[PDB]
Design a protein around this ligand. Structure first.
Ligand SMILES: *[C@H](O)CS/C=C/NC(=O)CCNC(=O)[C@H](O)C(C)(C)COP(=O)(O)OP(=O)(O)OCc1oc(-n2cnc3c(N)ncnc32)c(O)c1OP(=O)(O)O
Ligand SMILES: [Cl-]
Ligand SMILES: [Cl-]
Ligand SMILES: [Cl-]
Ligand SMILES: [Cl-]
Ligand SMILES: [Cl-]
Ligand SMILES: [Cl-]
Ligand SMILES: [Cl-]
Ligand SMILES: [Cl-]
Ligand SMILES: [Cl-]
Ligand SMILES: [Cl-]
Ligand SMILES: [Cl-]
Ligand SMILES: [Cl-]
Ligand SMILES: [Cl-]
Ligand SMILES: [Cl-]
Ligand SMILES: [Cl-]
Ligand SMILES: [Cl-]
Ligand SMILES: [Cl-]
Lengths: 153, 718, 4
């Protein structure tokens, strides 16, 4: 697989990947808003034909919680066929390094639904995130989110 | 003209527009209008209010009747600009804004708006004049400088771009921030301008001088390596590319670049030093084994015995780990059909080794060790291989072997469904995919695959019930309506194609039109960024946006939807019963023309009554949308009833034609269209263009020419 | 993933 920074021209393919894999979706405009606002934070995995097969869609907190700059994963997923390879872990490390070097992020945070065993085992155990707390009825269907938060230090 | 009681009321009109809720506003205008109807601005303010809470031609009339009254007045032109813009009439909003500004030369916001309109229309020339006029109005803000530079860069006027950026950068001798990240991007943009004007040699020098100012370390290093490779500064490229692999050893292009820098590989093909080319990759295995690239990549270029040894080592590697992705990985090697045979024979032998023993091949029993559950993964590989190669019988035996081993594994059933699809057994493909889905109810993906297979089998409602498990159903038209809101292209396409082939045309047109809307929405989304990008200072990214946009309609999905629509519009022109979306059995009776007038009359009466109910049904749908503003006016049927489908097919063709040379189907569709329009010279040229590419003995070409011959010789008589 |  080929992991590399996201470009404008592969945003639609990030969207399509999101649509296939996650209940939480956005219109293309919101992807564009990520690209123009933080042009090097998002990464993408492509297949031999160049189409998007995994991604992380990252940003920096617009309204900084307590004045300290920090990153936010807003979405990450991989087509079912390319799972269990290391794609997500690798997409996550690339994106994190950029938050630090370009924006001076002192930490990053994300949301996972309480039952997503997969995502938890990825952040908590193999990317060393902490469970910050629990956000009641965060997803549209009412499921609770774990707020996860990794401190850079 | 000139009253002092209405002035405080004229103002409250405008203020109410500014503040939305246009209701109050109208009440502050109406008094002064039905007793002074000849005041253009009054008529104008009226209109935009009636436009705003909607709708729509009510407003356009008062605006027009007002604007024609005051020649004259920037206020009128301005609100005509607003409504044209809201209605996405961008070429006309520009024209309104230029006239508005030529009458109010000191209103700078008119220009700030015009710039957006002109950027959208790609009027680069006029954009530059507008951006320049804005930079003069306020040279205080960096963004105005960036916007003039970018505009000028977009015109290829690189030198003028350089002088602008250079001029601005010097007026900050102190600093250094500024934003910092604004500055970082400003530099990388500047390095683009230089490369574009003074070439690579200069750009390299400038890039080396801005290293301290550039935060995007990946852009810096990637840009640097490109230059260093271009100048044949091989040794420096070597070290730079190692900095990139250190950062990310999973970026294929880095490898082809490191190889090029060692001189082991040309910019095209990998020659020579076949021996040292390998060796580098072997060394690259010391680039922490946390990367598959050093062993996977050489597989692309290796051949003969050295391929066999390495593909063997690679396959066993991924088999012992139970990686379900192993075939999808190796799959790309099959481009040559020599390696395919090698891989096939290799993993076939794997399955029977694993017959009696637990070791691949034969000599492996001498190195001992064993494996329990590799057969599953070997079998699963073989199943995907033989499906790809087209065996199907062999393929199905292998999935069955796998399913018998471990019946709870989702992928095994995914593959079995595809094999069934390939056998032409759509109903059981659909059943098998639903079983796959059942094995994992929490995974939206397998849900999606299931719905697709259902759509392929023309089970539309079942599919919509299936995806309803993952959508946000709150609006509009349930799952399918949310899938449209979220711009899900594939579902709308598969649904549309399904409706098309059941002759449910109104629905097919509907779904395709949603694809049109999604693309139109994409084209339009850049709009706010002709402002927002310069406020963030993301100049190189903005440039990428502009050129992505320039060809956004050059897409498989848009093609497929346009194609589909045109074919249905053709049927709409040909068959007078097509507009009733007859059920397939009625469609075929009426299409064979062997039935009497007794049965024919009966079918039509039925078709009409059924359309009535669909229409009646659509009214109830609208009432439900409305009672929940912007509705949807054909929940199904308005399209299919068109008075002239050719015109619609023509519109569908517009955005296919610029890409005709790589997608000659556009030209053939065009030929078929203008044949029906009785316009044969325009028809034959399109057919000829299509004949040139792909053509002569091409099936679609000759059947179009036969159709062409049949209509042209029909215009006359003898 | 975040929920907007
Ligand atoms: C907001 O966006 C956060 S929550 C949303 C996450 N996305 C999704 O839930 C949907 C679609 N994409 C996926 O589901 C992928 O599985 C994710 C994105 C979760 C990870 O993809 P990937 O398969 O590439 O994960 P990884 O790169 O290997 O990362 C390390 C890793 O994870 C697992 N692992 C997680 N969960 C499981 C389960 N249930 N079973 C086995 N293994 C699991 C690993 O085994 C990993 O590798 P390891 O060797 O353990 O470190
Ligand atoms: Cl979907
Ligand atoms: Cl937005
Ligand atoms: Cl695909
Ligand atoms: Cl896919
Ligand atoms: Cl509102
Ligand atoms: Cl013009
Ligand atoms: Cl021009
Ligand atoms: Cl010119
Ligand atoms: Cl012009
Ligand atoms: Cl020039
Ligand atoms: Cl030199
Ligand atoms: Cl090294
Ligand atoms: Cl498929
Ligand atoms: Cl397919
Ligand atoms: Cl601006
Ligand atoms: Cl802002
Ligand atoms: Cl196509």
């Amino acid at each position: 697989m080929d992991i590399r920074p996201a470009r404008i021209s592969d945003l639609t393919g990030m969207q399509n990947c999101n649509l296939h894999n996650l209940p939480e979706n956005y219109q293309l405009k919101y992807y564009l808003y990520h690209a123009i606002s933080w042009p090097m934070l998002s990464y993408v995995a492509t297949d031999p034909k160049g189409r998007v097969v995994g991604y992380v869609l990252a940003k920096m907190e617009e309204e900084p919680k307590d004045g300290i700059p920090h990153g936010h994963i807003t979405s990450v997923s991989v087509m079912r066929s390319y799972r269990h390879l290391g794609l997500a872990k690798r997409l996550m490390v690339q994106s994190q390094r950029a938050m630090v070097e370009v924006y001076g992020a002192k930490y990053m945070s994300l949301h996972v639904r309480k039952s997503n065993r997969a995502a938890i085992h990825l952040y908590r155990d193999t990317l060393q995130f902490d469970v910050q707390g629990i956000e009641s009825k965060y997803y549209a269907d009412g499921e609770d989110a774990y707020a996860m938060h990794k401190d850079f230090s | 003209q000139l009253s002092p009681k209405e002035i405080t009321l004229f103002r409250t009109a405008l203020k109410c527009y500014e503040t939305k809720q246009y209701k109050k506003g109208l009440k502050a205008i109406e008094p002064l209008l039905e007793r002074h109807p000849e005041h253009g601005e009054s008529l104008a303010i009226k209109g935009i209010l009636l436009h705003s809470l909607g709708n729509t031609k009510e407003g356009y009339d008062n605006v027009r009747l007002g604007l024609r009254n005051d020649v004259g007045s920037g206020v009128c032109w301005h609100i005509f600009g607003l409504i044209s813009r809201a209605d996405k009439d961008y070429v006309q909003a520009a024209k309104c804004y230029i006239n508005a500004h030529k009458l109010e030369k000191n209103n700078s916001s008119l220009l700030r708006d015009l710039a957006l309109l002109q950027s959208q229309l790609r009027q680069y020339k006029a954009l530059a004049d507008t951006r320049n006029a804005l930079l003069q109005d306020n040279p205080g803000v960096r963004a105005n400088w960036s916007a003039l530079a970018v505009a000028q860069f977009l015109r290829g006027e690189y030198a003028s771009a350089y002088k602008i950026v250079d001029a601005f950068e010097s007026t900050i001798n102190q600093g250094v921030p500024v934003d910092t990240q604004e500055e970082s991007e400003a530099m990388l943009f500047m390095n683009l301008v230089i490369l574009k004007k003074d070439g690579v040699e200069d750009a390299y020098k400038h890039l080396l001088s801005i290293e301290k100012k550039v935060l995007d370390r990946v852009a810096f290093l990637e840009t640097r390596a490109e230059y260093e490779l271009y100048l044949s500064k091989m040794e420096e490229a070597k070290s730079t590319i190692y900095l990139l692999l250190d950062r990310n050893p999973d970026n294929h292009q880095y490898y082809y670049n490191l190889q090029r820098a060692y001189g082991y590989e040309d910019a095209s093909g990998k020659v020579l030093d076949s021996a040292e080319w390998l060796n580098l990759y072997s060394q690259l295995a010391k680039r922490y084994p946390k990367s598959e690239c050093p062993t996977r990549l050489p597989l692309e270029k290796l051949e003969g015995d050295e391929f066999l040894t390495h593909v063997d080592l690679y396959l066993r590697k991924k088999l012992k780990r139970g990686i379900p992705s192993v075939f999808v990985d190796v799959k790309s090697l099959y481009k040559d059909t020599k390696k395919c045979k090698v891989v096939e024979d290799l993993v076939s032998k794997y399955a029977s080794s694993l017959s009696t023993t637990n070791k691949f091949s034969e000599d492996d029993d001498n190195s001992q060790i064993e494996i329990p559950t590799t057969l599953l993964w070997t079998y699963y590989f073989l199943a995907q291989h033989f499906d790809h190669v087209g065996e199907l019988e062999k393929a199905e035996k292998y999935v069955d072997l796998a399913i018998d081993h471990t019946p709870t594994l989702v992928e095994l059933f995914m593959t079995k469904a595809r094999i069934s699809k390939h056998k032409g057994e759509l109903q059981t493909a659909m059943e098998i995919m639903d079983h796959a889905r059942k094995l994992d109810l929490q995974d939206r993906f397998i849900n999606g695959k299931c719905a697709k297979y259902m759509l392929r089998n023309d089970e539309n409602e079942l599919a919509a019930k299936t995806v309803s498990l993952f959508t946000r159903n709150e609006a509009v038209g349930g799952a399918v309506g949310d899938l449209a809101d979220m711009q899900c292209l594939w579902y709308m396409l598969e649904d549309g194609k399904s409706f098309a082939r059941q002759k449910k045309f109104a629905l097919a047109l509907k779904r395709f039109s949603t694809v049109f809307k999604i693309f139109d929405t994409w084209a339009d989304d850049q709009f706010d960024f002709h402002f927002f990008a310069f406020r963030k200072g993301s100049l190189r990214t903005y440039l990428d946006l502009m050129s992505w946009e320039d060809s956004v309609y050059d897409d498989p999905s848009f093609r497929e939807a346009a194609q589909g629509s045109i074919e249905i519009y053709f049927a709409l022109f040909d068959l007078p019963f097509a507009k009733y979306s007859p059920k397939l059995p009625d469609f075929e009776k009426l299409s064979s023309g062997e039935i009497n007038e007794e049965e024919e009359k009966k079918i039509y009466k039925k078709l009409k009554k059924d359309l009535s109910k669909r229409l009646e049904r659509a009214e109830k749908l609208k009432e439900a949308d409305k009672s929940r503003k912007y509705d949807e006016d054909p929940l199904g049927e308005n399209l299919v009833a068109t008075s002239e489908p050719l015109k619609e097919a023509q519109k569908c063709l517009e955005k296919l034609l610029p890409y005709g040379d790589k997608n000659p189907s556009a030209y053939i569709l065009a030929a078929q269209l203008y044949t029906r329009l009785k316009n044969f010279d325009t028809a034959s040229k399109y057919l000829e263009q299509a004949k040139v590419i792909l053509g002569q003995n091409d099936p679609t070409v000759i059947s179009t020419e036969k159709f062409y011959n049949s209509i042209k010789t029909q215009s006359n008589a003898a | 993933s975040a929920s907007e």
